[model samples]
Structure formats: structure tokens, C-alpha cells
Target: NKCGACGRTVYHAEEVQCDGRSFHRCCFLCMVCRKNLDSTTVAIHDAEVYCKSCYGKKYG
Candidate 1:
């Protein structure tokens, strides 16, 4: 699979699934707030990721 964050290949052992897409563990972060994120709490917008608080602030 391709990583949503880096737009690169994601091997099974190096992938983190989020919002129906995949990311590298290092890539799993909130783009705006810069906090690490897990699959259950990721906010996806097109190709970017955000924390709920940042998402609310910018797009709520």
C-alpha cells in the first residue's frame, strides 16, 4: 500500500493504517498541530492529516 503522508510505498511491517489509508509510523502525525496520531483519532482531509482540535479550529 501507499503511505498517505509520504506518498510512498508502505510495506506491511512498516505501515500504519488510518482512515482507510496507510502511513508510516513516523508519518502518523497531525499536520497542523504536529502531534503524533493513531488510527482511531486521525482527521483526514484529502491528503493531509490533523488532530480533532486543529480540525475544529480550521474547518469546523
Candidate 2:
């Protein structure tokens, strides 16, 4: 299936859920930290992605 942000087909890629949609795990990236994130440690603000630590460090 297609993914948000990536917009590429990823039926073979890892999977995760975010915001109100689901997509490839490639989108599980931190906006500030530039680190790969997991749904368990990811944060989403207005559809943007972030690591929870970076999210708090910046937005707090």
C-alpha cells in the first residue's frame, strides 16, 4: 500500500500507525532529532513526526 509522506508503495516494508492514518514505518521519523522512531516512542503534532524526547525538548 501507499504511505503518507513517503507516498511510495510499501507492501514489503515494515508497518506502523500514525495520526489518523496508517503507512510504512519509513514515516516513523523524528522531525527534530532526525532519528528513526517507533510508534511506542514517536510523537505526532499536527501530522508532523518526532521522537518523544525531541518533542518534549522542543515543545515543552
Candidate 3:
């Protein structure tokens, strides 16, 4: 599948799920933070990946 915004190929199956499909995790993370496609949540904006508590601290 392709990224929702950049149209980049999401070939990492089981990482990104969109519309009942699986793709690279970067696809969703990058779109949300508006950072590089492969940059992790924490790497891009100090986001704590997979952690809600830390997410707010970093994002909010």
C-alpha cells in the first residue's frame, strides 16, 4: 500500500494498518508528526512510541 499523504510505499506489513490493511509503521507515525517517513515518534518529536502517557508529555 501507499502512505496516506506522501504516497510512499508501505511494504513492511504488520506495522501500519490502514483501512483494514497492513503497512510500515512509519507510514502512520510520519503522517501524524509530519516528520521524515522513517523517523520514529521519539526520534522526530520526542514522542514515546506506543506509550500514551509519554505521548502527551511529548506532544501535549
Candidate 4:
């Protein structure tokens, strides 16, 4: 999958897109907030991926 926000590469628990071409699930986050899968929580909003803080601050 591709990051819905920045279009950056995504990675699984043991798998990562080193070539920067393969974006997978669980990598999507807020581009403005710079939230990632590690520090921020992942949630699906409006059919897109977002972080908890960014989503709440922006849409909540």
C-alpha cells in the first residue's frame, strides 16, 4: 500500500520497502503532523489513514 498522505514507502513489522518504491500497509500517517506508525496511533478516517492526534486536532 502507499501512504495516503506523503506517498512515502511503508513497511511491515519484519518487512520494509528499502528501495523506497514499495509502500505497504501501516505506513500511512499525517504529513502535516509528521506522525508515523511508531509514535502515533493509526486510524482510518474518511477512507484515508491518519494519526490519532492529528485527526483529533484537525477533524475532532
Candidate 5:
């Protein structure tokens, strides 16, 4: 599948899906802080992804 974060190919075993798109495990990250994110810590706003802390930094 195509990764939403980097627009590259992703293998099933290394894929993470968020906001209806697939990402390689390492590629899915907070846009501001660049921290790795999972479903619980990930935040989406204006079509971009951020970790909870950075999202709060920008959007809070």
C-alpha cells in the first residue's frame, strides 16, 4: 500500500493506518515535533498529523 506520510510503498507488516491512509511504521509522526505516533497519541487537524503534545502546542 502507499504511505500517506511519505508517499512511498508500505509492506503490510510495517504499515500503520491513520486518517484513512497507510504509513510505514517509522514514517508516521507528528508534523511539528516529529515524534512517532500511534492511534491514541495521534491528532489530525487541517489534513495534517501531529502528536498530542505538538498538536496542543499549535492548536491548543
Candidate 6:
């Protein structure tokens, strides 16, 4: 399947699932900071990914 973030092809194990969609693990990033998110630190808002801190700052 194509990544929801970067629109690149992704294999099952190479993808990260977010908002019920697939993203390459490397493509999943914090929308506010554009930093790669640690799997445990991912936050979803309005179908976008954010880090906890960034999400808090933006929507806290």
C-alpha cells in the first residue's frame, strides 16, 4: 500500500499504522515539528501525526 504521509509504496512490516492508515515508519512525523516520531510518542489529531509535546502545545 502507498504511505498516507509520503505517498510512497510501503510493505506491511515497513509501515506504521496511524489514524487507520499506513505510513512508512520513517514518514510518520510530528506535524508541528516535522520530526520523526517514536512509535510510542505518536499522537493523532484530525488525521495528522504529532508528538505529545507538540500536540500539547498546539491543542492542549
Best by lDDT: 6
Q: Give the worst 10-residue stretch by lDDT in candidate 5.
A: 31-40
CA lDDT of each prediction against the hidden true structure = 0.69, 0.66, 0.45, 0.50, 0.71, 0.72
Model 6, residue pairs in steric clash: none
Checking candidate 3 for backbone clashes, the offending pairs are none
Count clashing pairs, candidate 5: 0
* Candidate 2 per-residue lDDT over residues 1-60, each given as its tens digit: 666557676454566765665566756656556665666677787757667788888889
Badly placed stretches (over 4 Å) of model 4 are 1-12, 15-28, 31-34
Off by over 4 Å in 5: 31-40
What tens digits encode model 5's per-residue C-alpha lDDT throughout 1-60? 887567788778777666766677777777556676765567777776777788887778
**TM-score for all predictions?**
0.47, 0.52, 0.31, 0.38, 0.56, 0.62
Candidate 4 lDDT, 5-56, residue by residue in tens:
4555555552233233333345544444646654334555564445578778
Ranking by TM-score: 6, 5, 2, 1, 4, 3
lDDT of 3 at 30: 36
lDDT of 4 at 31: 41
Locate the minimum summed-lDDT window of 10 residues in model 4. Answer: 14-23
Clash totals for all candidate models: 0, 0, 0, 1, 0, 0
**Candidates' RMSD to native:** 3.7, 3.4, 7.2, 6.6, 2.9, 2.4
Better of 2 and 4 by lDDT: 2
Which residues of candidate 1, in runs, are more than 4 Å off? 1-10, 18-21
